[PDB]
Design a protein around this ligand. Structure first.
Ligand SMILES: *[C@@H](CC(=O)OCC)[C@H](C[C@@H]1CCNC1=O)NC(=O)OC(C)(C)C
Ligand SMILES: *[C@@H](CC(=O)OCC)[C@H](C[C@@H]1CCNC1=O)NC(=O)OC(C)(C)C
Lengths: 188, 188
């Protein structure tokens, strides 16, 4: 019994449509003015958020300690509204999951929910020719237009959709420690 | 709070993918080997059901007593499996509804759910140049590929999706009396 109600609460308060030179993506807002988007979106210095041109104050394309793409880009946005803080719904650790929902919020699909079933910690993925780590996999035929879609179970936001091979879909994990209010160094 | 669980139970036991010369449509099975599909599908003497070629034993393109298109075609299929009988979930009368779900089951979207919000008894619609009666309307930007999609609230199957103008979506009603085990006359 997929957590449709939870998915819908997340979509309603915590997603916007983002558009870059690469097209539209569902965008999950995490806290304050911080959101995520797949790294293949190629975030620049500005982005459209619900068709409003918006200054990108920071964009961090995450990579692990092997210097490998994680496919998550964290963005800080110059806008007035704060996102509801949903960090407490992010998992602490890598995990497998049951009965997940993928939800999309784009111009073409402003509110759509797809039960993808079981989600497994998959690991390595050649993503459009880019070596990528920390991938989650579900046996569902996801399509173009669903990148950035949010993967939830009840009470957890576990990843965002980034790829698919026609039979399976792939999400980059979200972990709680990606967003903890932290320390000082030169990142660009 | 949309009835996602109800929608999912209907999709799981009572839909198949149907494909005609016009493309793929979600197809709702109602009872025995009787199903529905939008009249614009142009059902012939055979149809594909989950990619299996299937004899169409009867196809009745419903019209009202003004001789106007209702956009429902009832089909009787030569296949082994019986549909779970869901006639008791069909409304008796025309009505307006709250918080409906539209669900799609095609090759491209084998399982997708879209909350469309309020559903109003709309009446007349010029559907792709065909005058049509008994239409339901929802303020949601439905797209090509969603025709045949099932419109539910908890406990009722109220219509199938047939059209849209980019801002609103339109479904043809289903009424309980369309499927009551009835009497004798020449219909073709
Ligand atoms: C989401 C982004 C997209 O559609 O970009 C257009 C090129 C894509 C989702 C998968 C496409 C096929 N099925 C999917 O679930 N991801 C994507 O295209 O990844 C790259 C690496 C850009 C090819
Ligand atoms: C469903 C059938 C379809 O896609 O046929 C391809 C021509 C269509 C749904 C609407 C299209 C735009 N938005 C919709 O919600 N219905 C449709 O195209 O109706 C006709 C009468 C065939 C034009």
């Amino acid at each position: 019994g997929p957590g449709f109600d939870f998915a819908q609460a997340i979509m309603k308060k915590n997603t916007v449509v983002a558009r870059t030179e690469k097209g539209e993506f569902t965008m999950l807002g995490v806290h304050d003015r911080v959101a995520v988007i797949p790294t293949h979106a190629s975030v620049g210095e500005t982005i459209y958020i619900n068709d409003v041109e918006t200054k990108v104050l920071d964009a961090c394309a995450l990579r692990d300690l092997t210097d490998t793409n994680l496919e998550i880009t964290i963005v800080k946005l110059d806008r007035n509204q704060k996102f509801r803080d949903i960090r407490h719904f992010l998992p602490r650790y890598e995990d497998d999951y049951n009965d997940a929902v993928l939800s999309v919020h784009t111009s073409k699909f402003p509110n759509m929910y797809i039960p993808v079933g079981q989600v497994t910690n998959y690991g390595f993925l050649n993503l459009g020719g880019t070596p990528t780590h920390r991938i989650l996999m579900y046996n569902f035929p996801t399509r173009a237009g669903q990148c950035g879609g949010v993967v939830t179970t009840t009470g957890k936001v576990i990843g965002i959709h980034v790829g698919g091979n026609g039979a399976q879909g792939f999400a980059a994990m979200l972990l709680h420690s990606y967003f903890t209010d932290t320390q000082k160094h030169h990142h660009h």
